[PDB]
Design a protein around this ligand. Structure first.
Ligand code: HEM
Ligand code: HEM
Lengths: 190, 190
């Protein structure tokens, strides 16, 4: 997967496992959510293309959101969209599969950097807009969480298990966006 | 309500109604959510003390969260807790009741400032910790959203209406935290 450097950034994030413990406590993420986000694994594995169709559909239907993938001339950069799509697809699996350990935190830092002007457009060597305004990362917690529910509900598991998977996904999405604020936030205010 | 200055800050926020329109689109908030957040009004009105008992209970049971209300000596500042509680109670009603217009945006800016070192501890003239790290504001979207659901479900309205009220509350909480990032975020990155 071009540009995907999980576990090999060779850069230790400015947050550690103690920070993560406290952040998990604030978002109410426990061992129960680890169990159920992992069960979401097998459920979502075969559906990732349809999930990305939904998410890219949402972005593409809103000029002010599609903006973030545009070339200077205002048209969508198709190379950029396609390359990011492969990494975004993989993130769905990583969220369900990966242990949230230091390697995971180091990639969280990287993902935040890539939305921020610090590293945006470098991974794919594209010319596009310099920064994704942080307000929209937070806003996206809702669509990224809520649009996942129909996909969780399809694989013939109990509605009770689906609800637990869904709450785990909401917490995990929130947790990650909180971490991605680091490069946006004034030093010492994070 | 001491310190509550909604509609009388006399300061125009750095975001306007066009910004709000675009942010509402990103969080999927529509006229349907306005209808249902308003219906949450009558439902939550009589329950606000119990809601705050729940939220203050959550904060109080976690030393690293209760930290934000502590005096320098590490003990909770009871005056601070009580004064904030009255404004936090009112915010529940404002979220359901108020039109999200420019006055509302101007108070959103104010609330963000009060969590941030810019204005924290000034409203109540207390000595406490200088800043609430932004990571925790995002994290709190989960507990503030999820713990509201049992209160929405109690007033004998249909489960279908409860679900619509709940989704509206999730979107509104997310929307607000997105706005409150403004004083935390490096200038031009919001
Ligand atoms: C909950 C919020 C969001 C999630 C979960 C999310 C997820 C992701 C992921 C997983 C990647 C690929 C990371 C990698 O390189 O491995 C990515 C990249 C990207 N996302 Fe987001 N994203 C969010 C918010 C946004 C928003 C609001 C936009 C605006 C359209 C956006 C546009 C982009 C763009 C343009 C890239 C490529 C950045 C680069 O140049 O490297 N994302 N996102
Ligand atoms: C979804 C996230 C949050 C919501 C909805 C929320 C809501 C509120 C509201 C409505 C107020 C009163 C605003 C006013 O002055 O009118 C307030 C103040 C305050 N909140 Fe939050 N809050 C959030 C996150 C946090 C977190 C994570 C903490 C950490 C314990 C916290 C601690 C405080 C403190 C210490 C104040 C007083 C700030 C000051 O000195 O003026 N809040 N909050």
């Amino acid at each position: 997967i071009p540009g995907y450097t999980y576990g090999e950034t060779e850069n230790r994030a400015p947050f550690n496992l103690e920070d993560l413990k406290l952040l998990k406590e604030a978002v109410m993420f426990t061992a129960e959510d680890e169990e159920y986000i992992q069960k979401a694994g097998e459920v979502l594995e075969d559906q990732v293309e349809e999930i990305l169709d939904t998410w890219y559909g949402f972005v593409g239907s809103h000029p002010h959101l599609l903006y973030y993938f545009t070339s200077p001339d205002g048209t969508p950069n198709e190379k950029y969209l396609a390359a990011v799509r492969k990494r975004f697809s993989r993130w769905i699996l990583d969220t369900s599969n990966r242990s949230y350990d230091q390697a995971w935190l180091d990639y969280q830092y990287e993902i935040g950097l890539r939305h921020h002007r610090t590293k945006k457009n470098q991974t794919d060597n594209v010319e596009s807009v310099p920064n994704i305004g942080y307000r929209y990362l937070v806003a996206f917690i809702y669509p990224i969480t809520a649009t996942m529910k129909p996909f969780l509900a399809r694989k013939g598991h109990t509605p009770e298990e689906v609800e637990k998977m869904y709450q785990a996904w909401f917490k995990a999405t929130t947790l990650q966006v909180a971490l991605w604020s680091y490069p946006y936030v004034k030093y010492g205010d994070f």
